[PDB]
């Protein structure tokens, strides 16, 4: 039962760093600072990070290093009753792989489109333009970079909905194929290779962010953007919505209990100081977001100053920020081509390693439960990634964005919250904090302080619950621009969302009715950990 191990610590580290740090650090965090009181937003963010994210981040890492098994097997051994958690985590990782990768596909596309002396998204006098086009963002109009991304790259204008996918963009399907080719030849041999591919995919963003910080700061109006970014407004502290955005951001940006930190840590050495790893990584992740914030907003200010665009029209979130707003500014500065190529190469590498960790969560969680595939890795993941690409062709259609948007709002959003909720409950109340502290002490030599124990037991459930409730309060029937989804689209969405969580009681019911004795006796057995 002696499994493989990381061929060097840094591999594991960069793997965890890579997984944690993605486009969210760029296209979501700085917007939330802006929206919620600038520098003042760092307070609920920090506190939520200190008592919510990091404890959970830590917890899963320790669970990984301790049990030496993937999600399904680990949770099964931790608590036989709540083994379905492992399954719930694996399929969530499985669903996300269907849509998350297309973002990287868009990244490479722009990277290939930036091999020109004049970037194709500057002007409004192209074949794909409309009279509503203007050179930059403006209320009541569309921007040249928007119409490029929409009417040309996406050809979204030709779809009337999710029922009408339209034709297949073969320039896009190609990019998606390339993504999976990279994904395959990074993961097919396991951590012996992926532990090296992360040396590029996790380090390049810091190289890129650096020369972009420099380029962004040297631009006129940069300091104005810094003001929009971090001007304190402590009135936001009193707002519950700010604490909610802080909590949600911390959770999804660290991704604890997603079964990937678990997977990566399962390959660690038993007596490894995973505590230092949790702290170091967590910091680097948030530090990266902070850095990226200056990077984004220095350019945003330059736009609002030397291009005469309202700050309200440029300070956005999500793919709109990095596929439209930022390239729009890039194209106006000298050596535009250079900045364009590295910016796109960046958010490609920002996505790749995250995609690595997501898939590896699945493959690892499976090899530990089914020796059939552990013997046959390459074949399995070739079959898996092929399934990805085939279904992923739907994302490469003219209405591909509608498919992407549906999965992004249903597949993993709610499911992983109620999975990780049961994760915290099982660990801190069924398996016990005392037993967990004991495990950690055996590994790293010392037990967790009372701080971490109180957090895992009391703060963490309230944390996760405060978020789940929050996302449900602000629910709205799925829409995008003027396109409103049919009732059935939301129905199928909740099925995909529920196909995960349904594993929690389904297996609980299954293993309950699969053991002998009485009800109190069934529990006792399905409560006893594996080491017994």
């Amino acid at each position, epitope marked *: 039962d002696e499994r493989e191990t990381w061929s060097g610590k840094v591999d594991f580290l960069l793997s965890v760093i890579g997984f944690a740090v993605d486009l969210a650090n760029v296209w979501r965090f700085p917007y939330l600072c802006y929206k919620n009181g600038g520098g003042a937003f760092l307070v609920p963010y920090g506190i939520m990070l200190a008592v919510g994210g990091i404890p959970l981040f830590y917890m899963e890492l320790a669970l990984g290093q301790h049990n030496r098994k993937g999600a399904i097997t680990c949770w099964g051994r931790l608590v036989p009753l709540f083994k379905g958690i492992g399954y719930a985590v694996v399929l969530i990782a499985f669903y996300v792989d269907f849509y998350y990768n297309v973002i990287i596909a868009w990244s490479l596309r722009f990277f290939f489109a930036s091999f020109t002396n004049s970037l194709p998204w500057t002007s409004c006098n192209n074949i794909w333009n409309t009279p509503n086009c203007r050179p930059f963002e403006s209320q009541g109009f569309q921007s040249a970079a928007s119409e490029y991304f929409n009417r040309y790259i996406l050809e979204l204008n030709r779809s009337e909905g999710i029922h009408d996918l339209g034709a297949i963009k073969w320039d896009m399907a190609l990019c998606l194929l390339i993504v999976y080719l990279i994904c395959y030849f990074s993961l097919w041999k396991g951590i012996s290779t992926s532990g090296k591919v992360v040396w590029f995919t996790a380090l390049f963003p810091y190289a890129a962010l650096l020369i972009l910080l420099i380029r962004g700061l040297t631009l006129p109006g940069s300091f104005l953007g810094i003001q929009y970014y971090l001007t304190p407004n402590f009135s936001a502290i009193y707002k519950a919505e700010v604490w909610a955005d802080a909590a949600t951001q911390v959770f999804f940006s660290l991704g604890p209990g997603f079964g990937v930190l678990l997977a990566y840590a399962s390959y660690n050495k038993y007596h490894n100081n995973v505590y230092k790893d949790a702290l170091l990584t967590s910091f680097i992740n948030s530090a990266t977001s902070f850095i990226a914030g200056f990077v984004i907003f220095s350019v945003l200010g330059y736009m609002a100053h030397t291009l005469g665009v309202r700050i309200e029209d440029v300070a956005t979130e999500g793919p709109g920020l990095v596929f439209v707003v930022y390239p729009a500014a890039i194209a106006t500065m000298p050596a535009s081509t250079f900045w364009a190529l590295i910016f796109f190469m960046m958010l490609a590498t920002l996505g790749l390693d995250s995609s690595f960790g997501g898939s590896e969560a699945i493959i690892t969680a499976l090899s530990d439960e089914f020796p059939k595939i552990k013997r046959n890795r390459e074949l399995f993941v070739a079959g898996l990634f092929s399934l990805y690409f085939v279904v992923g062709l739907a994302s490469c259609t003219q209405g591909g964005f509608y498919f992407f948007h549906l999965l992004d709002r249903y597949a993993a959003g709610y499911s992983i919250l109620v999975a990780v909720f049961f994760e915290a409950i099982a660990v801190s109340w069924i398996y016990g904090t*005392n*037993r967990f*502290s*004991e495990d950690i*002490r*055996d590994m790293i*030599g*010392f*037990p967790p302080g009372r701080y971490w124990q109180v957090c895992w037991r009391f703060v963490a459930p309230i944390f996760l619950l405060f978020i789940t409730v929050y996302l449900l309060i602000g629910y709205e029937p799925l829409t995008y621009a003027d396109y409103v989804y049919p009732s059935w689209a939301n129905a199928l969405g909740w099925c995909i969302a529920g196909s995960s969580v349904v594993m929690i009681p389904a297996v609980a019911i299954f293993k309950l009715l699969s053991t002998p004795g009485s009800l109190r006796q069934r529990f006792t057995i399905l409560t006893t950990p594996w*080491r017994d």
Partner: antibody
């Protein structure tokens, strides 16, 4: 406030069996890994066995493994050490010491109890 | 096992002297896992210097520890008469746990 008292111990012939005990008081006994450390008559310390706070992690020395059995009772606050196949080398002052944090060593030692293995 | 060897076995010292007893290991030990104990005559040992350099509570400032890898040492800046005891080094790095042969302080006259 913290107090450990070793009991048992005495004269035993080779192959004999005896069970040592250590009563703890002044702290949450169920939160600290306990350890038996013996001291030969030439005033030389030798670690015997360690038991985790929940008894789910046991470690023995080479000269003791397979013969001694360390045990815990978190209900009545008692560290146990059942010995069997006692050889003359086992003759020592057996100390009950606690060591939860490996990076801090044994912060508290009992008064000790004497075991003599002779024919 | 990782055998710790302490020298000197017996050390003769008059109060006011600066002394240094050494603790050598057969295998490398992490600086946070090597500890020192003091044992008076007819008494149970007490934790003296944990994690190489850190003094345990009640331990006077005249005591200190240093070293790394396979070579550590306890130093008494200015010996007092009350420091007449035996000092044992111990590693908590790997199992089985091992103590040093010990070094005994004796007074001169």
């Amino acid at each position: 406030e913290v107090q450990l008292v070793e009991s048992g111990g005495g004269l035993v012939k080779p192959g004999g069996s005896l069970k040592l005990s250590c009563a703890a008081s002044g702290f949450t006994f169920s939160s600290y890994a306990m350890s038996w450390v013996r001291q030969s008559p030439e005033k030389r310390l030798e670690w015997v066995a360690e038991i985790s706070s929940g008894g789910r992690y046991i470690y023995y020395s080479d000269t003791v493994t397979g013969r001694f059995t360390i045990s815990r009772d978190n209900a009545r606050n008692i560290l146990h050490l059942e010995m069997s196949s006692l050889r003359s080398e086992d003759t020592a002052m057996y100390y009950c010491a606690r060591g939860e944090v490996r990076q801090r060593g044994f912060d508290y030692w009992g008064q000790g109890t004497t075991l003599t293995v002779s024919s | 096992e990782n055998v710790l060897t302490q020298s000197p076995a017996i050390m003769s010292t008059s109060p006011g002297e600066k002394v240094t007893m050494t603790c050598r290991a057969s295998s490398s030990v992490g600086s946070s896992y090597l500890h020192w104990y003091q044992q008076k005559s007819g008494a149970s040992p007490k934790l003296w210097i944990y994690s190489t350099s850190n003094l345990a509570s009640g331990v006077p400032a005249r005591f200190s520890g240093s070293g790394s890898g396979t070579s550590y040492s306890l130093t008494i800046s200015s010996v007092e008469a009350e420091d007449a005891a035996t000092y044992y080094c111990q590693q908590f790095s790997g199992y089985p746990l091992t103590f040093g042969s010990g070094t005994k302080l004796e007074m001169k006259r």
